[PDB]
Design a protein around this ligand. Structure first.
Ligand code: MG
Ligand code: MG
Ligand code: MG
Ligand code: MG
Ligand code: MG
Ligand code: MG
Ligand code: MG
Ligand code: MG
Ligand code: MG
Ligand code: MG
Ligand code: MG
Ligand code: MG
Ligand code: MG
Ligand code: MG
Ligand code: MG
Ligand code: MG
Ligand code: MG
Ligand code: MG
Ligand code: MG
Ligand code: MG
Ligand code: MG
Ligand code: MG
Ligand code: MG
Ligand code: MG
Ligand code: MG
Ligand code: MG
Ligand code: MG
Ligand code: MG
Ligand code: MG
Lengths: 126, 119, 99, 207, 71, 87, 50
RNA sequence: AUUGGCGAGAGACCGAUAGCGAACAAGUACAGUGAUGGAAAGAUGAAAAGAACUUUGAAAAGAGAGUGAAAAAGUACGUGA
RNA sequence: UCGAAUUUGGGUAUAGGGGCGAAAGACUAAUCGAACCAUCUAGUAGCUGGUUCCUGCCGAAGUUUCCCUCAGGAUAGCAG
RNA sequence: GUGGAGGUCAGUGACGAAGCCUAGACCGUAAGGUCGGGUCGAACGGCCUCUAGUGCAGAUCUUGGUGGUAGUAGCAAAUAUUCAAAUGAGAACUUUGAAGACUGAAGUGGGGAAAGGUUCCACGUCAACAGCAGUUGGACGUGGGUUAGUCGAUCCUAAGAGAUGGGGAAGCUCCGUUUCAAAGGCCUGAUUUUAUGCAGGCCACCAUCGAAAGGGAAUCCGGUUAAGAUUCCGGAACCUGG
RNA sequence: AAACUUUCAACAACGGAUCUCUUGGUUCUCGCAUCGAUGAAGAACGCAGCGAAAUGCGAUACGUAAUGUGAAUUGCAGAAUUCCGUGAAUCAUCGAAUCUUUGAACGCACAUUGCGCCCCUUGGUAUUCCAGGGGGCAUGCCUGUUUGAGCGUCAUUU
């Protein structure tokens, strides 16, 4: 249950805040859980998805397909994975939008800021 | 591309003026080429570089004037704080804290004592 | 109009009374605010007891002179008899009434 | 809103123009022009007898009658047939009223509070809750009233030593001090027979 | 406008709506190192200002336009 | 002839654009805006004209300066600048 | 009037530049709900009143 | 005290002819010389995957083929009196 | 009728119980025996119209007295 | 019988909730309830209670939608069209040619003022619009186009409007336009790093706004564009200030 | 007998009711006090590679600077990909600036993008004419400064 007077349970306010969230807030909203291997290797549960991460689809018709993120398309709350596409009738390939909550992160794109974030969350960072 | 403000801030007044003139010449050439090209998205970078150079030149000029007026009465109004019209009208801390020494003697002799009730 | 056997009523509602209807929806909210204000003031003036000592006085009129009640403040004669000045009594939490 | 349906300068055209006498929007050139206004029968008009804030909302009840109803509800909690009819799965409870040791008042964790309730027999009632959870039927589901469920047991203590926070997250389970004993909790929906689990100190303090 | 460049020795510019004929003359001389014979101005129906700058006989407006970059 | 033939004679203008409110309510011969009251110092408004007040009131424009007052107050009308360099 | 003030000419210039159909790429934007220029003004239908 | 401003939390309230006039580029379009008057208008699909290709037609389009869980969802788009 | 008490453009002045009128209560933006706009205002109406599901039981009055009362009320009667 | 609320049936449901259609079935005197079939796609019931913005055939009711009338009235003023070719899917209506007519110089011609605002011109182009039609268009889409010392404005004052001094008005403001006001700028001395120093009078005119037909400094001819010209080009002049 | 008319059903129309939905409204409660001559509210015009709006902004024009975050924006194009970084972003934050023409609106005026004056400076031979750049010139009132007026008036001086 909810205890603080600074937080609201209004569904209308929650949905307005979600749909009008700016890009920086959408970064956090688009978080993906780590795989078992990375969870053991890093000691953390979920991270905000990045463009060069490697992911595995665990839900939907594309479940089981691996790949690398190609775009974190924050404007429509979706990520695009290379080699996960739909083939249109006119020979063209179109990326398929996926939600990071339905993915799992298998290999993490790392730099100074990501490593600092992992340690800030309590990551061993093998 | 585009210039960087922290890099401009190490340059002197004349170097910045020369850079501004060069950027305006480059913008003129780009505006000429735009009439021939279907799209020239590179004009935006040069425009923003011009804006940044003007910002740094203004910063140096205003800081020099602040140095001239440092530690003296009657600063220029654009260099004075712009809190609010009513806030600038309001009495200063010293003026608001002025008391007659009849009241100063009263306050000194009989301040609000702190006390506790036992039971 | 007048009909049947009913008492004569005097409902004063011939002005624009609906413009000046006060409903105390905020009774609970203001009780909470008063309790918060008291807690804040107690913390601010701690350990002072949040209210001055008041004298005992006789209520006026024939209807209430059988009762005593708290007055505004002690008289200057009462403070002098107790052995302190009015200025100091006001600083140590005694309400003083000069009139 | 007090001004709803009246933000208009509409006047009746009167008779003689083969139209109803309703006040009509003046001017021209928009489509709203010449339309009926101000009437409860009119689209965009003012409703009949607009709702007022000074409608009576709270109802005064005599203190003695409130205590009468609370006492009756408490006595109804000790009738096995009333609790069963009210809807609690007390068919296998040893005895009603159900009194457990005062050790329950000091239980800190939700896990052990639930284990204690299941040990003393509230497992079926707890399972009836969180199995009865349903989406609300109607428009209340987007007025912050999305989900409905059944009420579970009410645990009555004498001194809060962690039992309230231990049972706070358990669905349907309510907690109460003997000093208060809300009638809303004792007879939900005005139906007597709340399933109540007493601590020993609470049971003694009832006198 | 491009016919005027060679058929009349006239350059056609879009200019600031705040500029007058003296300013246009001074600006053209400064920017392009030419001597100006005359400046004719009008306000276009789109709210911008167009200037016909006839250069002197000592400068070929087509050569100036080539140096500037257009055509 | 007070109708259609008389309407054919409407080719003057009683009102032109007002410099203050930009509305084409500047009465030419009275030299007064019928909407905003220009050139009077005060802006024309009436309590019986609640809709007109709503049409021209604060917040219906840009609030070029006033829109930042709430942020400046909430930060306390601070002066100077933020310090830390970079991460 | 063929003898017009600059203020009138400036208003006419703004109206001329506004008199255009909706750009086509607008319709392809994510969550677009604009289907046409609803403020389209023509000289034969509605007068702009100075 | 507070039908204004700013920041919050709520409801046995209304649910697109309702609720503010305005859920949408609404005090907008539009009317009037002017003061002023002042609308209508939300919903494809999880995803455009918005129908490649063939054929008839000047073309719109039709007929196939195909996409889709559904075209008894084709942008004249939920249901469809 | 047509060389003047002529016709007419533009500018300008007069504003609502006010103007203007070779005077018709004419005209004053299709509005005139008091313009138009908004507000008071959901103005008042003994007067016209309407007033939304079923079944069951009982079941009238248009008469008395008073009223600037006579298309309305009070009053008694009839009814539940 | 309807919207919402407390409780309960650990009620129904993407294996199909709600809604809608159904001369298909059942229950109730009735208000109504229930079931099957079709369509559909996301929520919804029974019971006990609570609550109301709770039930429509009418109000020349409100808003919206739709009929019969009815392929009906009407598209009959302004003398009037015809042949051929081209283009085009398509020609009574577009283009060209030929012919027949009309306006008949207080024009159906050539320009302008107010007003409009791009309607001008070109290219593409016909879903809507054009009293039929349309390949055409003042339509639609995209662009191009308005060049001044001399033409106007700008200056002057007209009937008027209107600050200031001052007076009135609770006040929004009103009067008044030179008034009961201490209401200003000309020449000359000028060492021209540089602007002044004292000179001696000079009317007493009181701000300002008010005319694209009144007053008023000065430009013509020829040529030139798809569309500009007393404005551009060529030539030939003139005025003002210095 | 058909046609026609009428009734019912199925399918197809017309139309947009019903059901479900909801970034909107409405009401109640709580907290806070902050517009403007340092030029507000409001108005006009303009600014984007490709925008008519809405939103944002002001010739530094969907923005500059600073701070945080830490890799986007997205309809297309373009660019970036040294992205393990003083660094993407129509991000957030915001304390430095810019802020056209206006507006109480302030040189005068304004149905004009009209007409002046003062200081510094530059160019045209130039204190005087013309032009460009920068900075200025409203009213009432207050305190003070300076220069004054009045046989209002004091003393001293011809
Ligand atoms: Mg329902
Ligand atoms: Mg010109
Ligand atoms: Mg007039
Ligand atoms: Mg017309
Ligand atoms: Mg509505
Ligand atoms: Mg609407
Ligand atoms: Mg719909
Ligand atoms: Mg289906
Ligand atoms: Mg469908
Ligand atoms: Mg449909
Ligand atoms: Mg005669
Ligand atoms: Mg009339
Ligand atoms: Mg009147
Ligand atoms: Mg009425
Ligand atoms: Mg009967
Ligand atoms: Mg009658
Ligand atoms: Mg039927
Ligand atoms: Mg169904
Ligand atoms: Mg769905
Ligand atoms: Mg009702
Ligand atoms: Mg009906
Ligand atoms: Mg013909
Ligand atoms: Mg046609
Ligand atoms: Mg043409
Ligand atoms: Mg066109
Ligand atoms: Mg002239
Ligand atoms: Mg003049
Ligand atoms: Mg011509
Ligand atoms: Mg010539």
């Amino acid at each position: 249950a909810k205890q603080s007077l600074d937080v609201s349970s209004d569904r209308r306010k929650a949905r307005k805040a979600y749909f009008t969230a700016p890009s920086s807030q959408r970064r956090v909203l688009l978080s993906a859980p780590l795989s078992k291997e990375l969870r053991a290797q890093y000691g953390i549960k979920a991270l905000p998805i990045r463009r060069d991460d490697e992911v595995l689809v665990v839900r939907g018709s594309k479940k089981g397909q691996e790949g690398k993120i190609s775009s974190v398309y924050r404007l429509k709350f979706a990520v695009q994975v290379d080699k996960v596409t739909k083939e249109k009738v006119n020979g063209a390939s179109v990326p398929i939008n996926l939600h990071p909550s339905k993915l799992v992160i298998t290999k993490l794109h790392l730099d100074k800021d990501r490593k600092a974030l992992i340690q800030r969350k309590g990551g061993k960072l093998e | 591309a585009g210039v960087k403000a922290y890099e401009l801030r190490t340059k002197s007044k004349e170097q910045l003026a020369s850079q501004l003139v060069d950027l305006k010449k480059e913008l003129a050439e780009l505006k000429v080429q735009k009439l021939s090209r279907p799209s020239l998205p590179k004009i935006k970078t040069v425009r923003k570089s011009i804006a940044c150079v003007l910002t740094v030149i203004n910063e140096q000029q205003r800081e020099a004037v602040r140095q001239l007026y440092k530690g003296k009465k009657y600063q220029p109004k654009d260099l004075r704080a712009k809190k609010t019209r009513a806030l600038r009208r309001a009495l200063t801390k010293f003026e608001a804290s002025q008391v007659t020494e009849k009241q100063r003697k009263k306050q000194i002799a009989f301040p609000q004592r702190k006390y506790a009730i036992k039971a | 109009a007048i009909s049947k056997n009913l008492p004569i009523l005097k409902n004063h509602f011939r002005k624009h009374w609906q413009e000046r209807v006060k409903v105390h929806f905020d009774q609970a909210g203001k009780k909470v605010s008063r309790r918060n204000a008291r807690a804040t003031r107690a913390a601010k003036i701690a350990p002072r007891p949040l209210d001055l000592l008041r004298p005992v006085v006789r209520a006026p009129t024939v209807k209430y002179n059988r009762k005593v009640r708290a007055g505004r403040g002690f008289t200057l004669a009462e403070v002098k008899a107790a052995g302190l000045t009015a200025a100091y009594a006001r600083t140590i939490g005694i309400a003083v009434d000069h009139r | 809103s007090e001004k709803a349906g009246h933000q208009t300068s509409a006047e009746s055209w009167g008779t003689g123009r083969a139209v109803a006498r309703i006040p009509r929007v003046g001017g021209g050139g928009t489509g709203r022009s010449g339309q009926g206004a101000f009437g409860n029968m009119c689209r965009g008009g003012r409703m009949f007898a607009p709702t007022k804030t000074w409608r009576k909302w709270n109802v005064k009840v005599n203190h003695n009658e409130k205590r009468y109803a609370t006492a009756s509800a408490i006595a109804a909690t000790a009738v096995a047939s009333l609790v069963l009819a009210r809807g609690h799965r007390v068919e296998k409870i040893p005895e009603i009223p159900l009194v457990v040791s005062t050790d329950l008042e000091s239980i800190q964790k939700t896990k052990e509070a639930v284990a204690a309730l299941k040990a003393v027999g509230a497992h079926s009632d707890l399972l009836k809750v969180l199995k009865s959870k349903k989406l609300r039927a109607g428009k209340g589901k987007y007025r912050n009233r999305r989900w409905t469920q059944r009420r579970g047991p009410l645990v009555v203590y004498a001194e809060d030593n962690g039992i309230v926070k231990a049972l706070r997250n358990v669905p349907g389970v309510e907690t109460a001090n003997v000093a208060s004993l809300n009638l809303l909790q004792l007879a939900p929906g005005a139906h007597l027979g709340r399933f109540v689990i007493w601590t020993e100190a609470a049971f003694t303090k009832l006198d | 406008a491009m016919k005027k460049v060679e058929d009349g020795n006239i350059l056609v510019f879009q200019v600031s709506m705040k500029a007058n004929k003296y300013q246009i003359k001074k600006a053209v001389k400064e920017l392009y190192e030419v001597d100006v014979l005359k400046v004719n101005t009008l306000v276009r129906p789109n709210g911008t200002k167009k200037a016909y700058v006839r250069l002197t006989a000592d400068y070929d407006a087509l050569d100036i336009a080539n140096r500037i970059g257009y055509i | 002839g007070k109708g259609t033939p008389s309407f054919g004679k409407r080719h003057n203008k009683s009102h032109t654009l007002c410099n203050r409110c930009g509305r084409r309510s500047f009465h030419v011969q009275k030299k007064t805006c019928s909407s905003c009251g220009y050139p009077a110092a005060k802006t024309r408004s009436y309590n019986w004209g609640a809709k007109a007040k709503r049409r021209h009131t604060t917040g219906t424009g840009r609030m070029r300066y006033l829109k930042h007052v709430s942020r400046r107050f909430k930060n306390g009308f601070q002066t100077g600048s933020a310090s830390k360099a970079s991460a | 009037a063929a003898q017009k003030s600059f203020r009138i000419k400036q208003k006419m210039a703004k109206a001329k530049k506004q008199n255009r159909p909706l750009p086509q790429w607008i319709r392809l934007r994510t969550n677009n709900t604009i289907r046409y220029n609803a403020k389209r003004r023509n000289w034969r239908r509605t007068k702009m009143n100075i």
